[PDB]
Ligand binder design. Sequence first.
Ligand SMILES: Cc1cc2nc3c(=O)[nH]c(=O)nc-3n(C[C@H](O)[C@H](O)[C@H](O)COP(=O)(O)O)c2cc1C
Ligand SMILES: Cc1cc2nc3c(=O)[nH]c(=O)nc-3n(C[C@H](O)[C@H](O)[C@H](O)COP(=O)(O)O)c2cc1C
Lengths: 177, 174
Amino acid sequence: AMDQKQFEKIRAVFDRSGVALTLVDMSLPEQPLVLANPPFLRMTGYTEGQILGFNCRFLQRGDENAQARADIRDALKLGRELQVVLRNYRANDEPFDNLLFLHPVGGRPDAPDYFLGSQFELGRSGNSEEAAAAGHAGALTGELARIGTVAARLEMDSRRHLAQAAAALVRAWERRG
Amino acid sequence: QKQFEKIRAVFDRSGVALTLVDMSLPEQPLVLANPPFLRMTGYTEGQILGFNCRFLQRGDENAQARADIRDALKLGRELQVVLRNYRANDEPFDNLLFLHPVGGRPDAPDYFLGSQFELGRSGNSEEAAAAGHAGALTGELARIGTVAARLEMDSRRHLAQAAAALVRAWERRG
Ligand SMILES: Cc1cc2nc3c(=O)[nH]c(=O)nc-3n(C[C@H](O)[C@H](O)[C@H](O)COP(=O)(O)O)c2cc1C
Ligand SMILES: Cc1cc2nc3c(=O)[nH]c(=O)nc-3n(C[C@H](O)[C@H](O)[C@H](O)COP(=O)(O)O)c2cc1C
């Protein structure tokens, strides 16, 4: 538990945003969800009140995504940025492919207080998934800048970058499934 | 002024080039320009306002796109076109213009918004770069209120698909 003005600045950006966003507290060992906005809630099918305080891995079932889960754990110890695809399940147990953006937030360079997670859903954009992910990445970068995670000076390069990573990961998703 | 102050306050804070044009005045004059747009063009806000954005053009390289612009304007509809433009030092550049109706009601838009994505600054990643622009833009259009609450997502995807469809053409078109 750290700075709270910072925390409500984040919450405010989270609630009026058109992209699924989540925040995770890195001072607690189980790494609990500490925010989850409505697009995220709408995507998964949960209330804020039934997942706040729990690791996000509840969206999984079993031992899928180990390779991706490995990338994830490494980024978290290092406090690094990471993008990655995950098999997830709604409260329906309805399957959905989850393009997840992870961004270290606040704290110190190697030990952030929080991690930010952004979920773009794969499959529902039909024909042009690359643009949609990239579009999502462009919106995300917009939010990350609003909370001061991305320097305003760099928002254009960063946007270019995330959007590039996003489509590339979409491509590798397409040529496999 | 008030609804114009809000729009200004969003322009000045933005990572995308934004421009506003008054749709009640007949020369359709620049009434706002944001810092990224200024940096892209190398102009000062004070030396371009009250002019029509066609000043960034030279000669007659944009006829076809200019007919589409005039159409979209007349009709109050959104549009995306590629334009050959030039900077304050006459350096040429390619301009993926996103045009959006803003204000008023569907029959009579108060203003038109313009968002310039410069093409060629992004290597082989133009489609993702442009669609990323599109994504940011949508977020900014929601931030003004021309998209609805559960409209941001599918508008964004729509727009980004058009964004890349147009840069794919631009890359084969020449
Ligand atoms: C901010 C943040 C957001 C996350 N979002 C998701 C998610 O949306 N879906 C998911 O399956 N895992 C998500 N995770 C990851 C899980 O919490 C966990 O880190 C991942 O499954 C690796 O955990 P494990 O190998 O210990 O099971 C997120 C993690 C963080 C820090
Ligand atoms: C909001 C807005 C932004 C515009 N931005 C540009 C621009 O960046 N470059 C350009 O060449 N034209 C731009 N235009 C269009 C021209 O000002 C003008 O609308 C167009 O050239 C109409 O055709 P005309 O010149 O034959 O009258 C913009 C128009 C609007 C309404």
